Paper text:
In line with this proposal, the genome of [name] harbors a chromosomal class A (Ambler) β-lactamase encoded by [name]. The efficiency with which [name] thwarts β-lactam chemotherapy stems from its ability to hydrolyze penicillin, cephalosporin, and carbapenem classes of β-lactams. [name] is a 307-amino-acid protein that bears an N-terminal Tat signal peptide and is natively exported by the Tat pathway in mycobacteria. When [name] was deleted from [name], the resulting cells exhibited increased susceptibility to β-lactam antibiotics by 8- to 256-fold, thereby linking [name] with the intrinsic resistance to β-lactam chemotherapy.
Given that earlier [name] crystal structures were for a truncated version of the enzyme that lacked the first 40 amino acids, we decided to crystallize the full-length version of the enzyme. Crystals were present in the P21 space group, and diffraction data to 2.8 Å resolution were used to solve the final structure with molecular replacement methods and the structure of the truncated [name] enzyme. Despite the inclusion of the authentic N-terminal residues, the overall structure of full-length [name] is very similar to the previously solved structure for truncated [name], a monomer containing an α domain and an α/β domain. Previous sequence alignment of [name] with other known class A β-lactamases revealed that the region 102IRSISP107 of [name] [name], which harbors the I105F substitution, is quite different from other class A β-lactamases. Whereas most other class A β-lactamases have either tyrosine or histidine with their aromatic side chains covering the entrance to the active site, Ile105 at the same position makes [name]’s active site 3 Å wider than other class A β-lactamases. Interestingly, our I105F substitution reintroduces an aromatic side chain in this position. While we were unable to solve the structure for [name](I105F), the structural impact of this substitution in the context of the neighboring [name] residues was investigated by modeling the I105F substitution in the wt [name] structure. Specifically, we found that the measured distance from Ile105 to a nearby active site residue was 6.7 Å whereas the distance from the modeled Phe105 mutation to the same nearby residue was 10.3 Å, signifying a significant increase in the opening of the mutant enzyme’s active site compared to the parental enzyme. Further structural alignment of the computationally modeled I105F mutant with both wt [name] and TEM-1 Bla revealed that the mutant’s active site more closely resembles that of TEM-1 Bla, with the Phe105 mutation aligning closely with an active site Tyr residue of TEM-1 Bla. While this structural model is insufficient to unequivocally establish how this mutation improves catalytic efficiency, it suggests that Ile105 of [name] may function as a ‘gatekeeper’ residue that regulates substrate accessibility to the enzyme active site.
Numbering used by the authors: 28 to 83, 86 to 145, 145A, 145B, 145C, 145D, 146 to 291
Write the structure that this text describes.
């Protein structure tokens, strides 16, 4: 049979490169397919960005109002344009950056992180405090979805991002109150219904953060719980460089790969 042969069949069917990592657990072996190849973050980074901001500041910091203007509003931003008059709090921005992939919100949080490159260095720094020596962020939104294939900037690997998300949600990288805020935002995500959620049976709990870009880029990083409460971490990333910048991302690919994963964890 063999799970690798199946991921390769998915690649051929969807004409795409697929990366899958599920960290090991006390009872299950790691699941790997191109787990160490680089793929663009796209929006998957907005999840550990929220953790970085939570980590560097006391809970009271979520109450801080942030003001911005229309020139600040770039990339997909369903929440931010409805609050240019009023501004948004760090907390509301965290909510928006995760549940709606609001790109403007991802940029303000990067700005809040501080330093050179709009926050990208501080952020990459934050990933390093978690052992992730591979991932890097260099541009803000949207330039960060546009890097060409082979360019290492604004990339991670399934193996890397899985191990980060595991530390954040199931590990002790954040104290419980902050861990709970992060976990909840990912739990009430609105952008991921046709990706990893779609591939796992309904009676498995699924929290996630999606990513989409050019070159057929489609990602979903998730924490799932079996019907009897057993957690796993699942990172699935894809692109379709064969078709150029205008290549269509295929969400069914991520969902199918997730069903293959579910079958192996079952």
């Amino acid at each position: 049979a063999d799970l690798a042969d199946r991921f390769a069949e998915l690649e051929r069917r969807y004409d795409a490169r697929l990366g899958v990592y599920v960290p090991a657990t006390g009872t299950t072996a790691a699941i790997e397919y191109r787990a160490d190849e680089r793929f663009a973050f796209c929006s998957t980074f907005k999840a550990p960005l929220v953790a970085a901001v939570l980590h560097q500041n006391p809970l009271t910091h979520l109450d801080k109002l942030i003001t911005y203007t229309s020139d600040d509003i770039r990339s997909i931003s369903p929440v931010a344009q409805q609050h240019v008059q009023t501004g948004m709090t760090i907390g509301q921005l965290c909510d928006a950056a995760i549940r709606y992939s609001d790109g403007t919100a991802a940029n303000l949080l990067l700005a809040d992180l501080g330093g050179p490159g709009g926050g990208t260095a501080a952020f990459t720094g934050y990933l390093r405090s978690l052992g992730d020596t591979v991932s890097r962020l260099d541009a803000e939104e949207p330039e960060l979805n546009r890097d060409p294939p082979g360019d290492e900037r604004d990339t991670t690997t399934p193996h890397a991002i899985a191990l980060v998300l595991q530390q954040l949600v199931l590990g002790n990288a954040l104290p419980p109150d902050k861990r709970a805020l992060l976990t909840d935002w990912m739990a009430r995500n609105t952008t991921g219904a046709k990706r990893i959620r779609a591939g796992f049976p309904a009676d498995w709990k699924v929290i996630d953060k999606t990513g989409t870009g050019d070159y057929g880029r489609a990602n979903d990083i998730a924490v799932v719980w079996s019907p009897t409460g057993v957690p796993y971490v699942v990172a699935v990333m894809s692109d379709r460089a064969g078709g150029g910048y205008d290549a269509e991302p295929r969400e069914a690919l991520l969902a199918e790969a997730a069903t293959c994963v579910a079958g192996v964890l079952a």
